[PDB]
């Protein structure tokens, strides 16, 4: 346990993590390049500039009592005892890089009223002034960081996400803060596992495998320390698992975390505190040699580890820090700001308690911890030292002693040839300002974005949601074909006669398929009906060339029977349905009535009787609603059939009754006995009518054949009349 002691009137403590934590045998092992050495040298440089600064403590010199925490809370607490040895002197300590280390040291420092200013600890529970009333920090808490990455996740539509955190006072409170923030943003959590402080590589592999237990999640947030993040990346590479990471300031832009794990870190988004490099610190650090810098006791180990050599072998003088590239650690600015804030507090307290002399007066030899704390909580407002060219950064302390929630967003690239650098692609100044153009996996020419969701989306119109009553992880259950997806929560219906197609919200598709004139079953009678009309036209033509009244009526009577057959096949309408009932009844009656006239002024009487049939037909049709109607099937798989009315009504029966009476009237001519010829027509007419009844009876359904056979009966009925009452007559004039 080496000590860094600097002579001075009053000394400042230091708690930098110079050495990384070791195994069970050793308290702490290797020295870290950036987090331990660079920050310690930054504090030493800041102390050097303060001593020679005439405007800041010109008459009193500032010392140092920096100790190594070895990245452990117990060792840091022993060094805190080393701090409080004088009090049981140390006016203040500039240390506490780790949050658990900061809390452990502040717990002891509260008893002795020793103020503490931290440069890297961002734990949200350190803002509790009741528990830590002597603690301050130049960095913001983790609540703003959780808000920032919640906004980042919302930007990339990242809902179903996995949470990885390291146990302690930093990863934990961070993970609950992040989950609390993401709950309000409708962000789900797949798994929540913790990283132990003393865990082996097999345990890291187990954690990585547990991450893979949910293929649904693709992105994992990291609240682990640098060593834990590095081990997790190594385990992910070993298992050949490709992941995208959204890490906290623990990872940041540290190259040691991605050392040897460049493949598994591709596309990882890491945010870090917004800081600027110090031009003077780079020159100060690059001009350091192990012989010249005897002030630092740990510099020899740094030289041995960085430039691989041995002091005993005497092969370390060849290397130099100027030749090798130098990269400033991000939190150097925060260390400098903390040291300068403590120095400014001391200067203000000396200017308000020792106004006469310039050196440390006798009224301040015991330094009051409470007075000093209330002197740098309020009286610290000055331009940040070593601002690059024109920035307006100032060191400020709020009522909680925290900093400003200003963050920078980075991502890990390839940069063509192997360089594997970090590139800033946004910032969080109380608002997300991502730049997707600089991220080489979010460009439109890179394919679909890496998606981490729980429930796969689905086209609303074809398949509807289920609303499981949860925040996410829903299901897609399609609605039945007679349901329109009017709303995402539940589908609706267009109503009877409308098919929910096209837009699927307002549909209004109604099919109106008809029997058509070219039906397979109707192909027969349409040719027969046309043939009968053609035969009637030939019979009508010779009549004009030649009982005159009886023959003309009969020829005309056969004409409209075939004419109405073409009306039925084509299409039904409002006027068609009305004429269909009246025409069919009248034509059958007039043909039989005209035949009765041949059996027996007389023409006027039979037409007058026929006129009475029309009056009865109108009365029957009036009570039958002769208007057309597109009747809908009981179920949906059919369409409207355009049925005028029920065919089982008395409209057909009443017409047949008059026809039967007229047919029975012609039967009287058989008793009188072309008397033989007419009797044959009635006998055939009754049989063909009697043969139609079984056809209509069995075919209750399939209305197409019902209209087809109806046309068949009327078509051949006229042919029988014209083939038995006029064909023998034509034989004596044409054939003979």
């Amino acid at each position: 346990k080496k000590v860094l002691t600097l002579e001075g009137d009053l000394v400042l403590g230091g708690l930098f993590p110079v050495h990384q934590k070791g195994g069970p045998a050793e308290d702490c092992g290797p020295v870290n390049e950036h987090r331990g050495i660079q920050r310690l040298e930054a504090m030493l440089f800041a102390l050097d500039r303060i001593n020679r600064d005439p405007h800041l403590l010109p008459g009193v010199r500032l010392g140092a009592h920096i100790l190594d925490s070895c990245s452990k809370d117990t060792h840091a607490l022993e060094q805190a005892l080393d701090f409080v040895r004088a009090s049981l002197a140390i006016t203040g300590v500039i240390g506490g890089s780790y949050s658990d280390v900061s809390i452990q040291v502040a717990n002891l420092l509260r008893l002795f009223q020793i103020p503490q200013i931290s440069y890297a600890s961002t734990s949200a529970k350190l803002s509790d002034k009741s528990r830590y009333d002597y603690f301050a920090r130049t960095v913001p808490p983790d609540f703003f960081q959780a808000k920032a990455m919640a906004e980042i996740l919302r930007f990339f539509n990242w809902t179903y996400v996995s949470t990885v955190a390291s146990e302690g006072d930093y990863g934990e409170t961070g993970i609950e803060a992040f989950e609390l923030e993401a709950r309000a943003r409708n962000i789900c959590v797949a798994t929540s596992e913790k990283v132990g402080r003393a865990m082996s590589r097999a345990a890291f592999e187990g954690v990585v495998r547990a991450l893979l237990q949910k293929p649904s999640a693709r992105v994992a947030v990291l609240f682990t320390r640098s060593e834990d993040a590095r081990e997790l990346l190594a385990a992910s590479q070993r298992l050949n698992a490709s992941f995208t990471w959204v890490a906290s300031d623990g990872w940041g832009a540290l190259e040691s975390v991605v050392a040897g794990s460049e493949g598994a870190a591709e596309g990882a988004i890491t945010i870090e505190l917004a800081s600027y490099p110090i031009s003077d610190f780079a020159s100060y650090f690059q001009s350091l040699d192990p012989w010249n810098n005897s002030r630092n006791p740990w510099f020899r180990e740094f030289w041995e580890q960085r430039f691989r050599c041995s002091f005993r072998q005497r092969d370390c003088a060849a290397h130099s820090l100027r030749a090798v590239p130098f990269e400033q650690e991000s939190k150097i600015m925060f260390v400098v700001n903390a040291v300068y804030a403590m120095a400014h507090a001391l200067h203000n307290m000396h200017r308000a308690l020792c106004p006469n002399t310039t050196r440390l007066c006798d009224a301040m030899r015991p330094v009051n911890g409470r007075r000093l704390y209330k002197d740098f909580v309020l009286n610290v407002k000055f331009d940040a030292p070593f601002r690059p060219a024109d920035t307006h950064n100032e060191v400020r302390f709020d009522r909680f002693g925290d900093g400003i929630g200003r963050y920078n967003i980075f991502t890990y690239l390839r940069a063509g040839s192997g360089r594997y650098r970090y590139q800033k692609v946004g910032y969080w100044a109380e608002g997300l300002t991502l730049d997707t153009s600089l991220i080489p996996w979010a460009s439109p020419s890179a394919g679909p974005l890496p998606a981490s969701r729980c429930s796969e989306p689905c086209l609303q119109n074809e398949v509807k949601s289920v609303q499981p009553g949860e925040v996410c992880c829903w299901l897609c259950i399609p609605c039945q074909p007679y349901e329109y997806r009017l709303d995402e929560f539940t589908c609706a219906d267009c109503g009877l006669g409308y098919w929910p197609n096209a837009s699927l919200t307002g549909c209004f598709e109604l099919p109106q398929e008809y029997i058509r004139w070219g039906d397979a079953w109707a192909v027969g009678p349409v040719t027969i009906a046309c043939l009968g009309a053609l035969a009637t036209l030939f019979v009508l033509g010779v009549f004009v060339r030649h009982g005159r009244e009886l023959c003309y009526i009969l020829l005309g009577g056969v004409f409209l029977c075939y004419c109405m057959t073409f009306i039925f096949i084509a299409k039904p309408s409002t006027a068609v349905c009305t004429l269909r009932r009246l025409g069919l009844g009248t034509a059958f009656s007039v043909c039989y009535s005209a035949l009765l006239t041949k059996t027996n002024s007389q023409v006027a009487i039979c037409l007058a009787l026929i006129s009475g049939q029309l009056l009865i037909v109108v009365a029957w049709l009036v009570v039958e609603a002769p208007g057309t109607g597109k009747e809908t099937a009981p179920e949906r798989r059919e369409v409207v059939t355009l049925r005028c009315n029920h065919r089982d009504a008395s409209m057909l029966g009443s017409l047949a009754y008059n026809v039967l009476l007229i047919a029975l009237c012609t039967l009287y001519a058989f008793k009188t006995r072309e008397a033989k010829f007419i009797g044959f027509t009635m006998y055939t007419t009754c049989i063909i009518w009697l043969a139609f009844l079984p056809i209509f009876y069995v075919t209750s359904s399939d209305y197409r054949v019902q209209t087809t056979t109806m046309c068949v009966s009327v078509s051949l009925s006229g042919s029988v009349v014209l083939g038995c009452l006029f064909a023998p007559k034509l034989h004596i004039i044409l054939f003979q």
């Binding site: 809370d73 002891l108 008893l111 056809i695 068949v712």
Partner: protein
């Protein structure tokens, strides 16, 4: 403000005498049981060790007992007195709260001071790397968490909620139980509620609504401290939720009367756990015999008098009151563990004294600077028996063996033992009384057979979804389709045989062919018998004596054909159906064609040639029949409407006969082709009278009856039924044609001979 006792060896002490203060006040309300009873246990134990000749002879033990004040930060500044002189106490009795002990542990270990806690149950303090100088006499929460989930399993509910407070005990308690629940798999947490250590106004009212949101999780598990449980129970009374919640208290609420004081109606039947313990009869006598005069060593005892007796030194206080009768007295459950912790440190000192100072009776010179490193190894190696005979021992990590027992709060208002935990549960449900056997489960089971089991995000909630009347439930996980010839059982689990619909007499349509067949057979039997009876030479000359007989037999075969059409469907008979209709139709048509041709030929032996032509026409029909006989000797057809089964399962049974549409058309077409020849011959002949008139009528009847066959037979497709309609219409069509043809010729022959 602390208790100071002079002695050769000083023992530290930390007790929560006062409750946690509200707002900025460090100390709140006095704790009469958690703070006073436990503190007096140390005083009672020290006065008993100092009077025991066999334990530390001639060596007195002092005490420096401080006030924890139930605050983690407040105990740290008090503990500074134990180590201020170092940069003297050899060890301390650890605090009650797990969080309080942690800061004391990492500070006393920092000064090599062993610590033994009597009530600190936390897996965090079990780590030997950070708390190697810390020891405990009670089991850790890891064993308690395993015990809690065992009680949950045995009580037949697996959907519960977790309630915890801020600190290293409540947060690590629910986390340990959740981790053990994940290994179980059958138990899930609906939600987790974390009570802040500095709640605002109405905070406890808000968390009740959080548990009230999920009404399914009627049983909740609470890991809160004594003060929080009292406020949580009070908030339940505000929401009128008494009896709705089933509480699962931790070791912080095992048998304490403070969280249930004035709240007997609420939290009835709450199941509580606590490490195995027995009541100490020596402490009860010691405590009950304390007054304001004899007990002046305890500074807080004067304050305890007002709180216990509800007086002041309000109503005035008389200095003659007794604890055991003027107020309710029941010693704290952890009093025994305080005795064990004091005796364990005293036993180790005696064990270290006999080795370090063998000759000396008091403190030898090489023992006055006691070092914690040497004292600690003697702390872990004590195997004595404490009061009530319980064996106390420390493991390598300084922990105690896992021992637990289960209480239940019942009203008849006391805790009753209902079980125990000794690495396995020994619950006694028959004594548990709360609602009979309350259950807190998600998605209550459904098993009518049709209802499938769907797994939601939480494995506890089994979503319920029926299976339609088309598939069978092979298992509760998924239901699968029945075979197409199988109809699902009444319950969807498994399938059942599909019925059938055979053709038998008694049907509305099948009745007519049977009646006509009887009439047709009788009519054709009478005429053939009449000709055989008296065979007149003029009538037989026109008949031919060979053509008429086969026509009657051929027509009679059609009447026999319809008999087997409706007969029992069999593979032999159904295959022979085409033979019956084919032979009957061909015989009637062929002989009729020959008769028409012979009459036409003479108009514009002879009967011997006519029958040869008819036989030749029969031969070609038979030759074609033989081709159709072997082309597909199909047995029968089963599925008629079952081929395209209906959506419901009301009725799909159908019984058909092996028949082909092409075969039926070809068989009918051959007969119709012969009838077409008769149509042409009859038309030309229509221009002998006894032959033209009947023949013209026969072709007239066949054409019309066949003309109605096409739309009925072809139009029955996609109707209600096809096999039932088709067979009936086919039988009547051939029967009517045979009856009309035979009747038209037989009747004039019988009538002519009647008048002759």
């Amino acid at each position: 403000n602390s208790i100071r006792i002079d002695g050769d060896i000083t023992l530290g002490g930390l007790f929560p005498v006062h409750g946690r203060g509200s707002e900025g006040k460090p100390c709140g309300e006095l704790k009469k049981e958690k703070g006073i009873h436990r503190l007096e246990a140390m005083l009672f134990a020290l006065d008993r060790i100092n009077n025991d000749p066999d334990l530390l002879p001639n060596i007195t033990l002092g005490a420096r007992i401080l006030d924890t004040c139930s605050r983690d930060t407040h105990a740290l500044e008090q503990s500074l007195t134990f180590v201020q002189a170092l940069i003297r106490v050899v060890g301390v009795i650890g605090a009650s709260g797990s969080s309080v002990s942690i800061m004391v542990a990492n500070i006393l270990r920092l000064f090599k001071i062993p610590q033994i806690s009597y009530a600190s149950t936390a897996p965090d303090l079990s780590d030997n790397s950070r708390y190697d100088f810390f020891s405990r006499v009670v089991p850790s929460d890891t064993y308690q968490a395993q015990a809690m989930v065992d009680i949950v399993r045995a009580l037949k509910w697996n959907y519960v909620s977790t309630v915890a407070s801020e600190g290293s005990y409540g947060e690590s308690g629910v986390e340990a139980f959740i981790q053990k629940s994940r290994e179980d798999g059958g138990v899930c947490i609906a939600q987790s509620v974390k009570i802040p250590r500095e709640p605002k106004a109405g905070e406890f009212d808000k968390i009740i609504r959080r548990l009230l949101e999920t009404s399914n999780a009627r049983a909740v598990i609470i890991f809160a401290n004594e003060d929080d449980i009292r406020r949580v129970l009070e908030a339940a009374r505000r929401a009128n939720q008494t009896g709705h919640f089933f509480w699962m208290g931790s070791d912080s609420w095992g048998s304490k009367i403070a969280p249930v004081l004035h709240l007997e109606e609420v939290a009835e039947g709450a199941v509580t756990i606590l490490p195995k313990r027995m009541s100490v009869r020596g402490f009860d006598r010691y405590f009950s015999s304390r007054t304001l005069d004899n007990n002046r060593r305890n500074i807080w005892f004067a304050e305890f008098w007002e709180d216990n007796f509800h007086c002041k030194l309000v109503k005035k206080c008389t200095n003659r009151e007794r604890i055991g009768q003027d107020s309710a007295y029941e010693q704290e459950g952890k009093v025994q563990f305080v005795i064990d912790a004091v005796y364990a440190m005293g036993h180790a000192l005696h064990a270290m004294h006999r080795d370090l100072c063998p000759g000396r009776v008091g403190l030898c010179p090489r023992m006055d600077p006691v070092d914690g490193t040497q004292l600690l190894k003697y702390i872990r190696n004590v195997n004595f028996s404490g009061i009530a005979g319980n064996p106390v021992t420390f493991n390598e990590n300084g922990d105690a063996p896992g021992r637990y027992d289960i209480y239940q709060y019942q009203l008849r208002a006391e805790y009753k033992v209902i079980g125990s935990w000794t690495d396995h549960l020994h619950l006694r449900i028959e004594r548990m009384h709360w609602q009979q056997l309350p259950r807190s489960i998600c998605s209550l089971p459904c098993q009518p057979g049709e209802r499938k089991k769907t797994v939601k995000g939480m494995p506890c909630c089994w979503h319920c979804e029926p299976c339609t009347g088309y598939q069978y439930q092979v298992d509760r996980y998924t239901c699968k389709t029945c075979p197409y010839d199988m109809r699902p059982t009444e319950n969807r689990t498994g399938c059942r045989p599909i019925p059938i619909i055979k053709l038998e007499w008694g049907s509305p349509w099948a009745v007519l062919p049977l009646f006509l067949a009887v009439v047709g057979i009788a009519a054709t039997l009478f005429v053939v018998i009449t000709f055989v009876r008296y065979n007149d030479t003029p009538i037989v000359k026109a008949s031919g004596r060979e053509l008429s007989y086969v026509l009657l037999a051929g027509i009679f075969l059609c009447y026999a054909t319809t008999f087997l059409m409706i007969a029992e469907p069999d593979l032999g008979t159904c295959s022979l159906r085409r033979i019956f209709l084919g032979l009957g139709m061909s015989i009637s048509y062929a002989a009729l064609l020959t008769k028409t041709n012979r009459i036409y030929r003479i108009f514009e032996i002879s009967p011997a040639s006519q029958l040869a032509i008819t036989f030749s026409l029969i031969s070609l029909q038979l030759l074609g029949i033989c081709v159709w006989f072997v082309v597909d000797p199909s047995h029968s057809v089963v599925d008629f409407q079952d081929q395209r089964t209906l959506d419901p399962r009301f009725a799909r049974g159908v019984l058909k006969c092996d028949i082909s549409d092409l075969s039926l058309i070809c068989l009918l077409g051959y007969s119709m082709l012969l009838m077409v020849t008769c149509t042409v011959y009859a038309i030309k002949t229509r221009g002998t009278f006894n032959e033209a008139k009947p023949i013209g009528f026969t072709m007239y009847t066949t054409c019309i009856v066949w003309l109605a066959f096409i739309p009925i037979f072809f139009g029955t497709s996609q109707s209600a039924d096809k096999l039932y309609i088709q067979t009936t219409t086919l039988t009547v069509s051939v029967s009517l044609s045979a009856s009309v043809s035979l009747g038209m010729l037989y009747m004039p022959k019988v009538y002519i001979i009647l008048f002759h």
